């Protein structure tokens, strides 16, 4: 059933999956770089609630971030770390670090870091789009409320450039069916089906291997024809804003496997697009 889109459509039902479909409760920090609005939404079993909002925020520069020093705020889907104290009053009372660069950023060769949500200089110095070095600044008098809303939660960061990016039920359902079809192909050492879920042109890796060599490597590995038992859990699927006019999603999950002497849980992440035929194509894989 898990390989059928309509099974997932039934599971999703009337849930609000516009900011993603999550196995458990999460918060989503949604920033739009054109609107200069940051909102925090809680997701509870498909019910969305707006818990925080500030308008007239300061972000970094427009455009897709590429390198250390370009001053741009990254567009995409990230995670937020716990409140911390920079120890420099320039950042306001405290800060929260986003995970820029993520795996997709890295395999695309992007550089930089230090993309945080923080406040304003305690001495009153003004901020502008050039001074945050890509960080997102909220007024200090709103940061206590922001901190309370994100405290002790699993918190994601969704940053749009201009267009409003929302997940669609049909896309989440089709991707979940593709995910479990890809899982079955790996389980059965079915090289051809497995490889059909990778973008022959755009899939990128740390080791810079091209698709032809990746295909032959996987066929070699799969030739062991090992009997495998694998379970996915804690699946989170999220829409992925981008400036390439692609329908992209992030899929994260735990990979579980029992061994006669150990049960292993490992974190998996796929960054994917939906191709013109409606099929998942993996662009980066942990």
Residue numbers in the entry: 40 to 325
Copy the relevant paper text.
The helical morphology of Campylobacter jejuni, a bacterium involved in host gut colonization and pathogenesis in humans, is determined by the structure of the peptidoglycan (PG) layer. Pgp2 is an LD-carboxypeptidase that cleaves D-Ala from both monomeric and cross-linked tetrapeptides. The structure of Pgp2 contains an N-terminal helix (residues Q43-I51), the catalytic LD-CPase domain (residues V65-K201), and the C-terminal NTF2 domain (residues K208-Q325), each connected to the next domain by a single loop. In summary, we show that helical shape in C. jejuni depends on both the LD-CPase and NTF2 domains of Pgp2.
A recombinant Pgp2 construct (Pgp243-325) containing residues 43–325 of the native sequence (cjj81176_0915) is enzymatically active and was suitable for structural characterization. The Pgp2 structure contains one Pgp2 molecule in the asymmetric unit. An extensive interface with a buried surface area of 1130 Å2 is found between the LD-CPase and NTF2 domains, as calculated by the PISA server. The likely catalytic triad (C174-H157-G158) is located on the central stands β5–β6. The NTF2 domain contains three helices (α6–α8) wrapped around a curved antiparallel β-sheet (β8–β11), which together forms a cone shape domain with a broad pocket. Regions of high sequence conservation are observed on one side of the molecule, focused in two clusters. The first cluster is in proximity to the catalytic triad in the LD-CPase domain. The second cluster is formed by 17 primarily aromatic (41%) and charged (30%) residues that are clustered in the pocket of the NTF2 domain. In the wild-type Pgp2 crystal structure, the average B-factor of β9-β10 (residues 292–310) was 53.4 Å2, 1.8-fold higher than the average B-factor over all residues. The conserved CPase active site and NTF2 domain pocket are ∼40 Å apart along the same side of the protein surface.
